[PDB]
């Protein structure tokens, strides 16, 4: 579709994936990154019970197991509830599947409500959307403080169906490495199913995820879906780049 | 070395700048960006009393002064971001008088910051003082973006090129912004522009190198072998800060 050809090339989605090949390739990247950086003793990721963090957590744990067989690093899963964990079943189910070396639970509600309260005192009343952004950036802060404290790095869950449409700038997706960039949404499910995840763990934008994934694979979609995908892609470009300078804008 | 040529070319620092020329170019970048995004009604920057945010705040206010003369509605929102009692209050207040921002908002970050520290402590993670300083910086980032969203604006950052070596920037902390107009300046160039604009005096060390040698290196000048090695190790050790999370395609 010409405009689709630009995005297809930038988002790196493969037409197809062999599960065993793709999982091996994803682990090698994670394992090569640890091996190349002397100070990495842990990898840190929040476990929301959603499909993205579930696959990436599992990839990281499997990578950490094999790193320890090759001669020292740990995976630290982080539970990040806002108040009372209401999607507790999905979170616990993700954890049972990942088998993380360590689980840290940090409730973000006291920090988030105080950020909101501090601004309210300054005359700045956040909307519910803005309050949700504060939640996401606080989740980022917890993960990087744990990574700093445990001499590790923060692992992100950004992928290409995300990258194209979906993420709070400098919030929960902001990380040191983003291993599953290049997968679209259905590809994540395929890898989760191949790994034996319970299927409860892999089951608005004005466009379906099926149209997004097809679009990323270079397939033609309705004109109406093209405009929504394309407009979402263009309006989010600032998120795929650090702050604009005289030389990038 | 050819690594100096690599670094010099990536950091875009000019060997010398004409003060009035450079202030003009920097202002045009800010004005062109606002002009190109009709929904931007405000510009947001924390005013720490340090040279970078003083220069950036001043540039932005001049940019907004001229935008409104050309018929564009825009506002500069300077933010005081004290942790308890304003660290360098006399410098913050002197910068505020020098910039004369359209609006001044004060958000004390101490309660949110201590709540983050306390919540982590409850999980068994006792942060170091360096880590607490990182929490302060990332909370400063959150306040500015919360104000920017609420006031229909963007966050203006203070990154410049000498920060790519010193790396005082906290990853995803206070330097994180929507635009970074003074990228390409080194430190002495920031001071030159501030001094030219009539600024008053807003213009230990375990880096292993002076700021003068860093600036000289960025201008493509030769420095001693020891300075060259310390600088180059700092440049490579911070490469992950001037780029988004590495993927299979950005990590060679």
In SS3 terms, chain B reads as CCHHHHHHHHHCCCCCCCHHHHHHHHHHHHHHHHHCCCCCCEEEEECCCCHHHHHHHHHHHHHHHHHHHCCCCCEEEEEECCCCCCCCHHHHHHHHHHHCCCEEEECCCHHHHHHHHHHHHHCCCCCCHHHHHHHHHHHHHHHHHHHHHHCCEEEECCCCCCHHHHCCCCCCCCCCCCECCCECECHHHHHHHHHHCCCCCCCCCCCCCCHHHHHHHHCCCCCCHHHHHHHHHHHHHCHHHHCCCECCCCCC
Here the tokens at position B190 are 């920031």
CA dihedral A92, A93, A95, A97 (to 10 degrees): 160
Give the dihedral sign, CA A189/A190/A193/A195: negative
Nearest partner of A46 among A165, A137, A182, A169, judged by Cα: A137
Which residues have C-beta within 8 Å of that of residue B211, sequence separation ≥ 6? Answer: B162, B166, B187, B188
Instruction: Give B142's contacts in chain A (Cβ within 8 Å).
Output: 115, 134, 137-138, 141
Question: Are B102 and B75 within 8 A, CB to CB?
Answer: yes
Q: Provide the experimental method for this PDB entry.
A: X-ray
Here the tokens at position B53 are 């945010």
**Active site (catalytic) residues of A:** 52, 162
- Residue B195: count of CB within 10 angstroms of its CB: 14
Q: Is B91 a catalytic residue?
A: no
Which residues have C-beta within 8 Å of that of residue A20, sequence separation ≥ 6? Answer: A194
| Triad A128, A132, A135: Cα angle to 5° | 140
The number of C-beta contacts closer than 8 angstroms across A and B is 182
Backbone angles phi, psi at B79, to 5 degrees: -120, 125
Backbone angles phi, psi at A75, to 5 degrees: -100, 130
Resolution value in angstroms: 2.3
Nearest to A106 among B123, B157, B240 (CB): B123
Question: Are B25 and B63 within 8 A, CB to CB?
Answer: no
Closest approach of chain A CAs to the CA of B245, in angstroms? 4
- Distance of alpha carbon B145 from alpha carbon A170, whole angstroms: 9
CA dihedral A130, A132, A135, A137 (to 10 degrees): -60
Residue in chain B lying closest to A10 (CA): B249
Nearest partner of A196 among A93, A103, A45, judged by Cα: A93
| Triad B115, B136, B192: Cα angle to 5° | 165
Strand locations in A38-182, DSSP E? 42-46, 74-79, 102-105, 152-154
- Distance of alpha carbon B176 from alpha carbon A118, whole angstroms: 21
Burial class (CB within 10 angstroms; exposed 0-12, middle 13-18, buried 19+) of A50: middle
Question: Are B189 and B13 within 8 A, CB to CB?
Answer: yes
Nearest partner of A14 among A207, A236, A190, judged by Cα: A190
**In the block, which residue shows the tokens 């006291």?**
A110
- Indicate which residue of B91, B159, B163, B202 is catalytic: B163
| Number of residues written out for chain B | 252
Q: Is A45 on the interface with B (CB under 8 A)?
A: no
Here the tokens at position B226 are 């020891």
Nearest partner of A152 among A240, A77, A56, A249, judged by Cα: A77
Closest approach of chain B CAs to the CA of A78, in angstroms? 10
Residue in chain A lying closest to B154 (CA): A243
């Amino acid at each position: 579709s010409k405009l689709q050809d630009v995005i297809v090339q930038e988002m790196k989605v493969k037409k197809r994936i062999d599960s065993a090949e793709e999982i091996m390739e994803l682990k090698q990247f994670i394992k090569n990154y640890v091996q190349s950086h002397s100070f990495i003793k842990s990898l840190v990721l929040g476990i929301s019970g959603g499909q993205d963090s579930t696959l990436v957590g599992k990839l990281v744990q499997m990578s950490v197991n094999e790193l320890r067989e090759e001669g020292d690093c740990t995976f630290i899963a982080v539970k990040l509830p806002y108040g009372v964990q209401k999607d507790a079943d999905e979170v616990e189910q993700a954890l049972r599947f990942i088998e993380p070396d360590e689980i840290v639970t940090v409730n973000i509600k006291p920090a988030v409500d105080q950020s909101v309260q501090s601004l309210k005192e300054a005359g700045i009343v956040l909307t519910d959307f803005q309050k949700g952004n504060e939640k996401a950036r606080e989740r980022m802060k917890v993960q990087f403080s744990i990574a700093s404290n445990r001499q590790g790095i923060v692992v992100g869950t950004d992928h290409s169906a995300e990258n194209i449409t979906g993420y709070t700038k400098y919030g929960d997706g902001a990380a040191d490495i983003a291993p599953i960039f290049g997968l679209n949404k259905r590809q994540g499910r395929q890898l989760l199913a191949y790994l034996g995840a319970p299927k409860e763990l892999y089951e608005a934008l004005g466009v379906t995820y099926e149209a997004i994934d097809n679009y990323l694979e270079g397939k033609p979609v309705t004109p109406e879906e093209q405009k929504v995908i394309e407009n979402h892609y263009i309006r989010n470009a600032h998120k795929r780049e650090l702050a604009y300078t005289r030389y990038t804008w």
